[PDB]
Amino acid sequence: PQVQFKLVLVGDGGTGKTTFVKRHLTGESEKKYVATLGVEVHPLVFHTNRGPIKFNVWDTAGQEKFGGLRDGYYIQAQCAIIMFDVTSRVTYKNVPNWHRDLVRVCENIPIVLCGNKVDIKDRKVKAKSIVFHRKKNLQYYDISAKSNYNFEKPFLWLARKLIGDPNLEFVAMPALAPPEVVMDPALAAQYEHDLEVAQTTALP
Amino acid sequence: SGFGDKFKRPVGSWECPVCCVSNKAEDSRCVSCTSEKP
Ligand SMILES: Nc1nc2c(ncn2[C@@H]2O[C@H](COP(=O)(O)OP(=O)(O)O)[C@@H](O)[C@H]2O)c(=O)[nH]1
Ligand SMILES: [Mg+2]
Ligand SMILES: [Zn+2]
């Protein structure tokens, strides 16, 4: 038996969930279609200093554009990523709804909040406004699915929480689809700096 | 110490072949996707 975890990937339509999960090439080539739920389960293997860990990532077929997801989608999830789009404020405004829907079925499973599309110049949801994770004591990351920026961070955090090893490391990155856009290094440094500064501040 | 060495599946558990969720022995169908125990 392999060490594997059901990871539900939820968030508004158009936030980039499919693109993000698809970055992992073997997860895409070996994905399993669940017809009863209209789901694609991507097996994303990561190699840690203590062996392999597989996140079976559940990706919708777009149903979230028309309403909430059925119980079966969330059932027996062991972790989750909630994604929004930093170029669309309303996707961040819906984050509490996704969190509530998720905890209603799965309760207090480890969860990572991700703000996608940070490669885009005109960023609407800046670090100072991103506060929901601090209210629920969750981990947050900026990501860019199209540039692989920070792709591994949510999965490393989740692995550390699930295994109970804060020193767990990925000894090598998974094979990922080549970046379709460039993430300016200085822009990434600036956004990470803004994030830590925002962490200094307190939440009104 | 590798966590894969000490990892054991629960007695009677079966992995769903359609969606990979771990199910209980007394569950004839997958609790997540309703696919039938192989
Ligand atoms: N510039 C940029 N565009 C993205 C990114 N991620 C997704 N997009 C696009 O956002 C649109 C919806 O993406 P999709 O993966 O279908 O989002 P989903 O509905 O949440 O599954 C698509 O046109 C993507 O190409 C990103 O990280 N950067
Ligand atoms: Mg999608
Ligand atoms: Zn199943």
Cβ of A41 and B7 within 8 Å? no
B20 is in an annotated binding site: no
Pair A10, A79: CB distance under 8 Å: no
What is the spatial distance between Cα A2 and Cα A78, in angstroms, rounded to a whole number? 15
Cβ of B19 and A37 within 8 Å? yes
Q: 3-class SS at A183?
A: coil
Number of compact structural domains in chain A: 1
β-strand partners of A52: A47
What is the spatial distance between Cα A26 and Cα A144, in angstroms, rounded to a whole number? 19
What is the spatial distance between Cα A184 and Cα B8, in angstroms, rounded to a whole number? 44
Q: Where in the sequence is the domain holding B22, given as residue range(s)?
A: 9-38
Q: Is residue B3 part of a domain?
A: no
For residue A72, list chain B residues with Cβ-Cβ distance below 8 A: 31-34
Q: Where in the sequence is the domain holding A91, given as residue range(s)?
A: 1-204
Q: 3-class SS at A35?
A: coil
β-strand partners of A39: A34, A60
CA of B27 to the centre of ligand 3 (A): 11
Give the distance from CA A5 to its chain's centroid.
Answer: 14
Number of compact structural domains in chain B: 1
Q: How many CA atoms lie within 13 A of A33 on its CB side?
A: 4
Pair A175, A46: CB distance under 8 Å: no
Pair A82, A10: CB distance under 8 Å: yes
Q: Is residue B21 part of a domain?
A: yes
Identify the CA nearest to A119 among candidates A85, A82, A91.
A85
Q: Is residue B2 part of a domain?
A: no
Identify the CA nearest to A84 among candidates A64, A58, A54.
A64
Which method resolved this structure?
Answer: X-ray
Which residue of chain A has the CA closest to B30?
A72
Residue carrying structure tokens 């629920």: A136
Cβ of B34 and A72 within 8 Å? yes
Identify the CA nearest to A87 among candidates A123, A131, A121, A113.
A123
Pair A191, A107: CB distance under 8 Å: no
β-strand partners of A21: none
CA distance B38 to chain A (A): 15
- A130 CB within 8 Å of a chain B CB: no
The domain that contains B18 carries what CATH number? Answer: 4.10.1060.10
